[PDB]
Amino acid sequence: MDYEVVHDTFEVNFDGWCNLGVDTYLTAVENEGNNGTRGMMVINRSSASDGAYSEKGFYLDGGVEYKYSVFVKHNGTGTETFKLSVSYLDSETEEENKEVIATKDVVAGEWTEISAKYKAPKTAVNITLSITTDSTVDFIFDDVTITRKGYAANAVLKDMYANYFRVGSVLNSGTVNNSSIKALILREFNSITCENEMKPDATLVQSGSTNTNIRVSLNRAASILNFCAQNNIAVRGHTLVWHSQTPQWFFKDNFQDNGNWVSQSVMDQRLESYIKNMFAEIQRQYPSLNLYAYDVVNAAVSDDANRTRYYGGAREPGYGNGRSPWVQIYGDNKFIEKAFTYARKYAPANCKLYYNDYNEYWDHKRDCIASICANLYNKGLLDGVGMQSHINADMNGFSGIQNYKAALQKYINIGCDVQITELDISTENGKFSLQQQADKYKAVFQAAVDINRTSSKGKVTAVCVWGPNDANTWLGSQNAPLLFNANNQPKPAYNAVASIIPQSEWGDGNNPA
């Protein structure tokens, strides 16, 4: 058992560990760790199955044997039976099986090692270590260890663009288990956004929320944040307010999907609380994470010209289908400035606040987004406009290079920054070739680089692609819309984008400027 694949020694961050059981609480405390170090306390359990867990899919493969080892300590009376358990999901049967791998009776007051060798089936993905007891006893663990068993800049995006902006991609619960993508991200990208795991419905906790204390959870995001903090990859938060992927109950008097719409002043409380508590938890659990940007409000301007003309861009009130529960409560887009105010209040200083939207180069919508953002920038509330940049491969037309530069320029002319937040470039089911997609990718990065070489005030501080490869895109792979194919081989677009910056100007991707 040579290689060490995991070593969690909670000195800085929670290292990807979550509370098992909706009411269990994890708290990392100084000096309560093994050897006087920082340790991880698990409290408030209410059944032998409650406890703590960590998805380690990033680090553990199916069909491989590992030695799993954790030091634990409890402060009760007599012996406690500790259990280490491993869970996976069978990529065939789609069932979660959890087998207890080590059972060990542990005396009070003493740091003890619990460990065993375990080899999960060849078809196991999402391998998850969890610690529990045979009682509902409180405990503390430290020094989790899993083992087996067998500046010159590189030609990589983050290094090539180190003097210009971060270069981002996206991770999700599924891709976080893909070894091959882990290697890709580490090699190329210095920014990650969670595709879904930081949205309101992935983070809000219904049980026990109240108007002035909305409970939140990073359990869905934790392996990602952990992976990013551990490897010095910056993260964009996505997203605090959005008419989509937000539970209806969040908007209802009794925290139930079918309650009554709440008043504006009730919803102010809940809005502020969600925002305060999201920032508090990120700080609490991943203080070393470079949370460089956050999408405070997402996609609030309507695609409908009638609404941008006569209703300040408000979507239609309601829930689902592009309707907005925010407009349902507030009547209006006034909630936007509210969200940025609370975000300015609780975000770290280095965390830049973005209004993010798509079809951002369509005149009537562009004009409305630019106006909203300029008013916010001027009040000190907003730092940047996010251009989602869900575009196609056509140099001409609705998202062609002209419309796109015009929008990039009008955003930059506000004085704020710009980020290109969710870039993908659809071939429209093969209507456009990979060679034309390469041209559009080259045009877009080239336009960002040009802004940065020109002026001044405004900059493009990130360019991010909405996915790591063509096997993992929300547009479906028939639109092959990213820089790497389904085997992570670089496409023509990658070659193209890698050819814009001369070797002399490359810098340190881990310390971009």
Ligand X SMILES: O[C@@H]1[C@@H](O)[C@H](O[C@@H]2CO[C@@H](O[C@@H]3CO[C@@H](O)[C@H](O)[C@H]3O)[C@H](O)[C@H]2O)OC[C@H]1O
Binding residues (CB under 5 A) for Ca ion: these are 9, 33, 37-38, 142
The string of DSSP letters for 456-504 reads: -SS-EEEEEESSSSTTS-TT-GGG--SSB-TT-PBPHHHHHHTTSS-GG
Contact 399, 393 (CB under 8 A): no
Q: Which is nearer to Ca ion, 15 or 422 (CB)?
A: 15
- Residue 326: enclosing H or E segment and its boundaries? helix 325-330
Q: Which amino acid appears at position 196 of this protein?
A: N
* CB of 251 vs ligand X, minimal distance in Å: 19
9 binds, among Ca ion, ligand X, none (CB under 5 to 8 A by kind): Ca ion
* CB of 422 vs ligand X, minimal distance in Å: 6
Maximum distance among all Cα pairs of the chain, rounded to whole angstroms: 75
15 binds, among ligand X, Ca ion, none (CB under 5 to 8 A by kind): none
439 binds, among Ca ion, ligand X, none (CB under 5 to 8 A by kind): none
> Please, which residues bridge with residue 252 across strands?
261
474 binds, among ligand X, Ca ion, none (CB under 5 to 8 A by kind): ligand X
Q: Is residue 195 at the binding interface for ligand X, with CB under 6 A as the rule?
A: yes
Q: Which is nearer to Ca ion, 140 or 278 (CB)?
A: 140
* CB of 369 vs ligand X, minimal distance in Å: 13
Q: Which amino acid appears at position 199 of this protein?
A: K
Among 299, 339, 382, 387, binds ligand X (CB under 6 A): 299
The C-alpha atoms of residue 399 and residue 467 are separated, in whole angstroms, by: 20
* CB of 509 vs ligand X, minimal distance in Å: 25
Q: Which is nearer to Ca ion, 33 or 62 (CB)?
A: 33
Q: Which is nearer to ligand X, 394 or 422 (CB)?
A: 422
Minimal CB distance to ligand X: which residue?
474
196 binds, among ligand X, Ca ion, none (CB under 5 to 8 A by kind): ligand X
- CA 308 to each of CA 7, 78, 325, 407: distance values in angstroms, whole numbers, following the listed order: 53, 69, 18, 17
The C-alpha atoms of residue 205 and residue 215 are separated, in whole angstroms, by: 5
Q: Which is nearer to Ca ion, 286 or 355 (CB)?
A: 286
195 binds, among ligand X, Ca ion, none (CB under 5 to 8 A by kind): ligand X
Q: Is residue 319 at the binding interface for ligand X, with CB under 6 A as the rule?
A: no
- CA 498 to each of CA 35, 78, 401, 490, 509: distance values in angstroms, whole numbers, following the listed order: 48, 63, 19, 10, 14
142 binds, among ligand X, Ca ion, none (CB under 5 to 8 A by kind): Ca ion
Binding-site string for ligand X from residue 465 to residue 504, where x marks contact by CB under 6 A and - marks none: ---------x------------------------------
The C-alpha atoms of residue 400 and residue 449 are separated, in whole angstroms, by: 18
Task: Give the position of tokens 């899919």.
Answer: 57
298 binds, among Ca ion, ligand X, none (CB under 5 to 8 A by kind): ligand X
* CB of 52 vs ligand X, minimal distance in Å: 25
Q: Is residue 358 at the binding interface for ligand X, with CB under 6 A as the rule?
A: yes
The string of DSSP letters for 126-144 reads: EEEEEEEESS---EEEEEE
Contact 207, 215 (CB under 8 A): yes
Q: Which is nearer to ligand X, 195 or 272 (CB)?
A: 195
The C-alpha atoms of residue 211 and residue 255 are separated, in whole angstroms, by: 9
Site for ligand X in 379-398 (CB under 6 A): 388
The dihedral through the CA atoms of 467, 470, 471, 477 has a sign that is: positive
The string of DSSP letters for 352-391 reads: EEEEEESSTTSHHHHHHHHHHHHHHHHTT---EEEE--EE
Minimal CB distance to Ca ion: which residue?
37
Among 115, 135, 196, 211, binds ligand X (CB under 6 A): 196
* CB of 67 vs Ca ion, minimal distance in Å: 19
59 binds, among Ca ion, ligand X, none (CB under 5 to 8 A by kind): none
Q: Which residues bind ligand X (CB under 6 A)?
A: 195-196, 298-299, 356, 358, 388, 422, 474
